[PDB]
Design a protein around this nucleic acid. Structure first.
Lengths: 207, 78, 102, 187, 187
RNA sequence: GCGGUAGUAGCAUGCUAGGGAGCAG
RNA sequence: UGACUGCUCCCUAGCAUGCUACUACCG
């Protein structure tokens, strides 16, 4: 609660991952070995090795998901469409994505009309459609995070509300489970950022 | 019944326009999307018709595109 | 519970291609849509029940179209065994009666 | 299922046993006849259901393949289907402005930009022959899309300005004909 | 299903018993026939069932091991792809400015948000309209992030080249406005 | 004379696995 | 380019259980 209030004074470029240079078989990398939160302060990693031999599969997975290399091997970007902080551009072009309209089922509409539907003055009419969007819609929708402001709370009252909420959440049980007890449905869905160039979640849950 | 007909016709017209690679011109695509979204939200059946005329003018002012005359001789539009 | 009739009709009339505009390829869409729209028959307003009845008639029409439309050019003969259950209200009435049959 | 050897054997056994029993006889003959009959009856009864399951399964498979072929066919004619459907609905709408502009485009008089709706803004059309000019443009006013417009400029294929008084029946056929009228919407 | 170990004994016993039956001998030979054939079929039963169970078990095992091998092959190829991507993106780190700002740190750690801000070679700017344009990147060289940049290219939302001579107040409404400006670090 | 056991066929019940679709937050 | 959950319907394959039936062995 106090960190939230005190973090509004310091510059906004000193928050986020902290990176440094490590060596793998004499070649230099750039990896993240900590974080600087606005709420939790400075956090340092516990198992970091600078000099190492050729890396394994899970190390590859960890280093391919870190934004450090992607941000450090990209161009600077100054975007004036939004007021949110911008880091880098990964390519030399900006992608504009549109949304297409729907498809019309004419047979069903004719069948419904031939049975006394959609007459004037009726109490049943169509008001659900597929709406189309232009090129600059994704960024315009992302720009709605400007409504999120830093908020300080009344701590002596939150510390009691949390007890009451915990009383509400009392009839269940939980804990940690092993990797062979995890249930996943529809393993044919997308996997994330770097990973959607090589397969779905099935590839990574099988490999 | 004269309003749902024009909304369905507008949906079909926007689909036809999208099939002709219109979204490769940002200004034209933005205007078409605005018109199509405005027709579906209409409440009276005069503004919808003028917007429909404006939207159909986009398809008519493309020379190669489609054949107006063949598509009018197939027991279709007069 | 009952939904908004406009939502059901809009789901009927506006789709993504191949998923509809040819009902015979997917008749199980309208069965689910009629399951969702069953409790509209107890509403005091009259069009609300007409939605459910229209869905049932469309399902029957689609089945008849499929059977005849397949018997004509090809010579495969179809049967109507335990298929008429989908255009009678007793299959849908059992989904809102307590006795969890699945 | 009367086209299998099992049916023939079962039928012959049934007839023989029935005739022997109706004639009247002892116990051992009945026991032997039923012992030789029941095996054939089971032989018939197994295939009587196996054939039905095979036939219905084959019918379902042919149904599924027809559906797949039809979907693959349907998803390959969408442009023509959509254009035909759109013009059918445009017929059914039956509006005067839409009919006017569709006939005008069908005869050759198409616009060059989006038709404006305000009391201002410019509209440009192409008039390829004298008959279209006679029908639409009379005087200094322009009738298009069930509206009224005021001519302010005429440009030819050579981009030279042509005054309104110049255009006439016999005075026209010495000109670059694809004219371009630019007008504004009358109040 | 026809050359099982017990098949020879079963068939030979059946043939001998039925030959004895066709010989028209007494009832004792018939009782012996019945007992021997009953026990022969009983012993053939499990020999015909266990083998069929075992074959299906073996087939399931083969299928599972094949799919395991395929999964291993896919894992190997995805590992190769990830390694290639990492080593390819390594080769653009500009290892002199990065080293110059790393050594200035008191322990080797620096925020990630200031690496592109002080070591990048190219800058990309997206401009909504002309009023914003004339306040950010007016002219041919501008200053941002305490550095000097010089323009190299300007494109529009359709990715077509645009020259700075036509980015004016009068000509503004004739461009796909989400313009993208590319510059290089000066000196 | 009754029961037990071993295969075979039809029918019903609940789970697991695969595929297609619908709704809700 | 396609997120996380929950519920429901349809089709096929396997497993377990139960009902009936047909032969055979044993007492």
């Amino acid at each position: 609660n106090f960190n939230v209030l005190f973090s509004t004074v310091f510059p906004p470029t000193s928050f986020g991952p902290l990176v440094r240079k490590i060596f793998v078989d004499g070649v230099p990398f750039v990896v993240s070995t900590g974080y600087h939160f606005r709420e939790l302060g400075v956090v340092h990693n516990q198992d970091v090795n600078l000099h190492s031999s050729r890396l394994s599969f899970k190390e590859l997975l960890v280093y391919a998901a870190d934004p450090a290399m992607h941000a450090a091997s990209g161009n600077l970007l100054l975007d004036k469409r939004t007021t949110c902080f911008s880091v880098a551009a990964l390519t030399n072009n900006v992608a504009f994505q549109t949304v297409k309209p729907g498809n019309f089922n004419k047979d069903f509409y004719d069948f419904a009309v031939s049975k006394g539907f959609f007459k004037e003055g009726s109490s049943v009419e169509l008001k659900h459609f597929f709406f189309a969007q232009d090129g600059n819609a994704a960024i315009s929708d992302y720009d709605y995070y400007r409504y999120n402001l830093p908020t300080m709370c009344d701590i002596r009252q939150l510390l009691f509300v949390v007890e009451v909420v915990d009383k509400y959440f009392d009839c269940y049980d939980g804990g940690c489970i092993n990797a062979n007890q995890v249930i996943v449905n529809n393993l044919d869905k997308s996997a994330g950022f770097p990973f959607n160039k090589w397969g779905k979640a099935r590839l990574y849950y099988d490999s | 019944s004269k309003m749902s007909d024009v909304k369905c016709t507008s949906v079909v017209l926007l689909s036809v326009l999208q099939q002709l690679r219109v979204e490769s011109s940002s200004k034209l695509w933005a205007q078409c999307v605005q018109l199509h979204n405005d027709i579906l939200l209409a409440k009276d059946t005069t503004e919808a018709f003028e917007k429909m005329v404006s939207l159909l003018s986009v398809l008519l002012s493309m020379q190669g595109a489609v054949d107006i005359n063949k598509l009018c001789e197939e027991m279709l539009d007069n | 519970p009952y939904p908004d009739p406009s939502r059901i009709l809009g789901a009927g009339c506006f789709v993504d291609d191949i998923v509809k505009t040819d009902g015979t390829l997917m008749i199980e869409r309208f069965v689910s849509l009629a399951i969702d729209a069953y409790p509209l028959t107890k509403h005091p307003n009259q069009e609300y029940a007409d939605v459910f009845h229209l869905y049932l008639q469309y399902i029957r029409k689609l089945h008849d179209e499929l059977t005849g439309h397949m018997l004509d050019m090809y010579s495969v003969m179809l049967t109507n065994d335990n298929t008429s259950r989908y255009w009678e209200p007793e299959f849908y009435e059992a989904m809102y009666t307590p006795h969890t049959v699945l | 299922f009367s086209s299998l050897p099992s049916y023939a054997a079962f039928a012959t056994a049934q007839e023989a046993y029935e005739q022997a029993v109706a004639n009247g006889d002892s116990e051992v003959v009945l026991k032997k006849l039923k012992k030789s009959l029941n095996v054939a009856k089971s032989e018939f009864d197994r295939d009587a259901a196996m054939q039905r399951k095979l036939e219905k399964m084959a019918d379902q498979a042919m149904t599924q393949m027809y559906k797949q072929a039809r979907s693959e066919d349907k998803r390959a004619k969408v442009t023509s289907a959509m254009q035909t459907m759109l013009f059918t609905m445009l017929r059914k709408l039956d509006n005067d402005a839409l009919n006017n502009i569709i006939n005008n485009a069908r005869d050759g008089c198409v616009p060059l930009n989006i038709i404006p709706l305000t009391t201002a803004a410019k509209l440009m059309v192409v008039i390829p022959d004298y008959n279209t000019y006679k029908n639409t443009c009379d005087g200094t006013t322009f009738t298009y899309a069930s509206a009224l417009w005021e001519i302010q400029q005429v440009v030819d294929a050579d981009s030279k300005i042509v005054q309104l008084s110049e255009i006439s029946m016999d005075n026209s056929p010495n000109l670059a004909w694809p004219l371009i009228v630019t007008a504004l919407r009358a109040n």
